[PDB]
Amino acid sequence: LSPMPQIAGVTYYGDIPKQPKRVVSLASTYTGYLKKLDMNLVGVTSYDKKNPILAKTVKKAKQVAATDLEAITTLKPDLIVVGSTEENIKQLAEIAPVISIEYRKRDYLQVLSDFGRIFNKEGKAKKWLKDWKTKTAAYEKEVKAVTGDKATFTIMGLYEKDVYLFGKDWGRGGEIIHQAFHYDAPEKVKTEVFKQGYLSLSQEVLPDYIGDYVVIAAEDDKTGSALYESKLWQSIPAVKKHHVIKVNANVFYFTDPLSLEYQLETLREAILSS
Secondary structure: OOOOOOOEEEEOOOOOOOOOOEEEEOOOOHHHHHHHHOOOOOEEEHHHHHEEEEEEEEEEEEOOOOOOHHHHHHHOOOOEEEEOOOOOOOHHHHHOEEEEOOOOOOOOOOOHHHHHHOOOOOHHHHHHHHHHHHHHHHHHHHHHHHHOOOEEEEEEEEEOOEEEEEOOOOOOHHHHHHHHOOOOHHHHHHHHOOOOOOEEEHHHHHHHHHOOEEEEOOOOOOOOOHHHHHHHHHHOOOHHHHOOOEEHHHOOOOOOOOOOOOHHHHHHHHHHHH
16 A cells, blocks of 8 residues: 655545556656656556657557546556546546646656655655756756856747747746746746746737747647748747747657656757757
């Protein structure tokens, strides 16, 4: 039986096993945290299968959603991990013990040490957080020597015809840019995006939310076409100055340690080359 510590955002359904043998992850947000703690994942999400950093490590896991109850029963899990937003949690808890995580109650680093406490993997969690602390410190000085300590960054993402801004803690590299590198954002990003985490934005106002640098997440090359072709977009100083960092959403959606390792080298190299 897990000690099942009381942690903000963490709800247990049933008796969490001390050493889970057969974990089904239905939350793309947490799959890579479980993988980093070398837990055995027999099910994972479509997002995890599509994440080019994580997928290598979960080839053997079956792709499942919360709507695949019979398929999940057939995997015989001894633990299911979900986001608190998920459908069918009552039905999932009838299959196996559930850990349900309410997003944002613990930050991108705490989520790992929290799983460490739940699963008796506090050593692995601590070794990674130590090394993350070391490189992030060194990498911030390097990138700011290039940009200047005061340079503003905006995090944005594209999905079909949808445009979003992100703050410090909604992925797309905001955790590295704004937390790890301590980069400022433009005034309207601070007052209109940071608190709520994400903002669905009209294409038309993008210039008023972009200062020195913009990180733009997309799942493929074609999604950016019409925006990037537009006069409005080409009118942005950050665009003219080639201060756009286009990133692969299929890994940059996430904040698990494996995804972050890739995102940190990618962002560092993009800022240094600018």
